Amino acid sequence: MASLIYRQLLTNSYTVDLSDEIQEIGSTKSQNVTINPGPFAQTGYAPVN
Amino acid sequence: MASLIYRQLLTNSYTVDLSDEIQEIGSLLDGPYQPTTFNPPVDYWMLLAPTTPGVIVEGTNNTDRWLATILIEPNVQSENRTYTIFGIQEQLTVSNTSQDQWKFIDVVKTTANGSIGQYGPLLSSPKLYAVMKHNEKLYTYEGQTPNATTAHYSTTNYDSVNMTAFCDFYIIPRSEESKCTEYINNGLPPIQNTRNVVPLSLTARDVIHLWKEMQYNRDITIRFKFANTIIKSGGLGYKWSEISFKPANYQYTYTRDGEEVTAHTTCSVNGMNDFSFNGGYLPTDFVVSKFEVIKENSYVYIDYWDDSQAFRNVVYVRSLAANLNSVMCTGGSYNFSLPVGQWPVLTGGAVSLHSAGVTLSTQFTDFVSLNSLRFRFRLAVEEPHFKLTRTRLDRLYGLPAADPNNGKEYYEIAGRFSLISLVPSNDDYQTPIANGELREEFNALSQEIAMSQLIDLALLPLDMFSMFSGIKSTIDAAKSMATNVMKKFKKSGLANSVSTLTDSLSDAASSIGSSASAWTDSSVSTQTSTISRRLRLKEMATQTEGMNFDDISAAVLKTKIDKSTQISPNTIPDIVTEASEKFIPNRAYRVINNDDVFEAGIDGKFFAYKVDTFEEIPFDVQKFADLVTDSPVISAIIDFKTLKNLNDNYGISRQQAFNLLRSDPRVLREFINQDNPIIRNRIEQLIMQCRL
Amino acid sequence: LERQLGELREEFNALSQEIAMSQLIDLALLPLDMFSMFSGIKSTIDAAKSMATNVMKKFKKSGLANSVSTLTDSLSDAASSISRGSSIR
Amino acid sequence: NSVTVRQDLERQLGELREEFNALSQEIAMSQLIDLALLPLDMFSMFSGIKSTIDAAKSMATNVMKKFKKSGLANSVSTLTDSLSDAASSISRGSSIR
Amino acid sequence: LPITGSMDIAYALTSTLCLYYPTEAATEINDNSWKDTLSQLFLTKGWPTGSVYFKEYTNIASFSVDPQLYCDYNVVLMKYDATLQLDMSELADLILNEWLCNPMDITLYYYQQTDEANKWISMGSSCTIKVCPLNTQTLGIGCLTTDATTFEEVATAEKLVITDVVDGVNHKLDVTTATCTIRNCKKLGPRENVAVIQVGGSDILDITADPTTAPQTERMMRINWKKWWQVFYTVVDYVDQIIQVMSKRSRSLNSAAFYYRV
Ligand SMILES: [Ca+2]
Ligand SMILES: [Ca+2]
Ligand SMILES: [Ca+2]
Structure with missing residues (x-):
């Protein structure tokens, strides 16, 4: 019955460790983000002495 | 009730696939290594990450072949370049069609x-090369990434070939040839997974690594720094190629409440974002390929060690936590060496480091390996913005890699850290200042468990939390114990039998008894024994009444696991699986049908009797099969022989016999407390049958 | 990628004939679970892959899950709405 | 591209509990009994x-993480450990009546 | 435990008093034997010789540095200055009430205030407290956790401070620990041992940080004055009333300290 929520929240707590492992390993292996350039070219002045 | 542990372990095993996927992602590279000359050991890939234009490596058999590797930046026409190869300067004409x-x-x-010859073109964005010398052939990689294959060369005296090398290396x-290919064709993993972190020469000879709780709380000062790889590209010098974070290391000393603590730390950042400023395609336009900046999505890891009792008592840790303060990392200004015109400058960019946990690690040095603690800090960008003068990248946030220091x-x-390390102390004193048989012991424990309290425990349901909490x-x-137990429980014999039963039922859905069911697939002794061996799975299927043999087994398993002092976390999964598959091999199951009882055991003993008078009746195998197919099956915790003995020597009431x-x-439990010798003997035999 | 699903629907609808009623009732009695169903x-x-998770990802979005959520929300609102009193048909 | 946006401060837990308790007025007995009969599970509770x-970010995971450390979890653990010790023929104490 | 009484039944020399006074009082009195004179007058009132102990403090701010009240009954003659209302209120809140204090290590941890009864009490030669509130992710709100110059200043070279920040939010503190110590103190209730006599202006002591309450307890007295001799004669002549206003400490036990008892 409605107490099933408490009983399940106790029983299934072992998944907290899986979540923590996911978090730590994901932090360790977060790949580099690519800042994609916009459509517009970044052309500027020429090197002028 | 206590049998629920087996059902939960078998049901929730699907999460073992998630855990294994995480562990596979976890799957270490040995390196990097300083540029030196050495003999490559056989059976080992050498991966090479170059940093500056030139000859990456030069190795020869000194008998019939002299091989070398050359790296050239893209966007170069057909030019004659000079290189010091094999200790001999030579000029070769080469062109770079590729642009990136x-x-x-x-x-x-x-x-x-x-005369020198050139071969094995490779167009690599991650700038990684590979080599092997095995199977009487030399392996080198070829083909544009990610389509990079392995090419084989024949150079005699393969096991006695020496290389002279000039960059960072990994073994x-x-x-792990597949991992080598993936790394070369897609780039190195984040640096935190490297063994040496920093080059640390090639001295890879170092070694890596009742109980009483000891606290070693301390105050620490982590002093660290950043390092850069500014790899200018070719041409007139108007364009660069890479400004990247590399791991840095720092040795310092500070006072820690009286003791001069000399410490060593290494800082490495992960998750940076690769900005770029492509100024165009002219030979004299300011073009930049990859400048990496750390922002909210990037972490920074600092491994810290010191020559203290606290840090030599870190082998086994029962609790670890830190509450370090937050620090500000501001960026410097890096003036580009532009040949002509105003000099662009990468000035500004601040971030804030705040603690986000701490875990054990292993730093390395040129002579020894350290058992360090890894502090992971989350980032937070702050008011100082970083600009790229003489360009249009203004008002950007984060800390670039130009001059992070x-x-x-x-x-x-x-800040402060607190750890509780476990030390193996066998006496009330002598606290150390640093850091078949199991089955027989488990069986021996069976002789010191109280039966009434065991029945209480068996009535208690043991869920995932209760069993291992x-x-x-x-x-x-x-951290990982339920996962470990499930990993083997889902492969044990009991799980296999559950799967086979389910498959048999499914196949039958598309004959000992009247009807042909997968449940009922001396002749009578053999048939009843087979049926009972299958009925053992009725308990797992949850189609029983009253106590269960596996309820008793789960209770005994929990009691013995709590008692034992010679059970290791890596041993618990095997013990649990063995208990589930072996405890109480001889199980008997009974079915009651309108004043008639049919009881059958796995050992081929079958009885049929009347509920009221316990008088034996000729066993009817067909009726027994028909009833046991669907009607609930009661585990015969008190078998027919014990019931008849108890009735003869004691006046069982009608309610007592029914129950x-x-x-x-x-x-x-009522009879156990009354101390009935017959029932106590029966329960003792059941307990003692819980062997391994 | 629903063409494969449609062919699967046609395949499954043809297996209705090849079913035994008594064995089907036995299978229905057997409590299929996260392990038994896919083992x-x-x-x-x-x-x-993680077949159980792959199944659950779409199961938790199917219409049955939405109906369960709707029922739970309705019961919660009914328990919450003393004030409405008789504002439910 | 901007400075980190600080998450808003949540609430004072004392006043949060006060408001939560005050919500008990808006409860109907019959509908509450129906909701109690309905078995709330990991899905229904948080849907x-x-x-x-x-x-x-796995609200269920957060609830479980903070729940397994609660006093109720500790009491369940103590009960299970006591039952196991009793079943293991624990040496009963002098005043363990 | 329960204490049962009766509402019809007719139920039908061993204590010490300490008078704390400012230096200027003695300076104006200018009689080397004035303490002995007051002792003899207290004796006339019924206080055996040696039962009254006279303590001299130089200023309210100086006396506020760890006030040391060591008699069975304490009376503090506090002079009034219109520029020291908050200082007088802080001293009265410190002594007239009982605080359960624990040490605070600002340089390591962050701190918050649990409820309305909890505050931070800082004492020393010079307390210059600056605070920075933090959010759930440990980032400063209106301040940078690393740059202490941006912190918000709640005290300035104070001998005594009773700081009250918003409850339920972590704070980072930059209190000058060299010349000051700050403690996390929870107010338990009233300290009946001590009474304050404000010898000066208006009644201004707000011993409750709550802005809606400025209760005037029976132990907070006020007298207009022009001669310290007259003030002391008043105290001696109405000692009975002052003692009747006060009561013996009910605090079960705290850190050991020196006392002047019989
Ligand atoms: Ca400010
Ligand atoms: Ca003050
Ligand atoms: Ca407050």
């Missing part, structure tokens, strides 16, 4: 005084 |  | 919560 991939070319000389055994010798993070382990061990036949925990 | 699948071809 | 919060 570095060209690796192997150089071959079949004779000492011959990856043959079996901003001229400062070090960044300091002061009372066993205390190390920080690394306690005993139905396996009533209440009546069973 | 004995035909072959588990190379590197079978 | 209709927080509307449609984007991240929803």
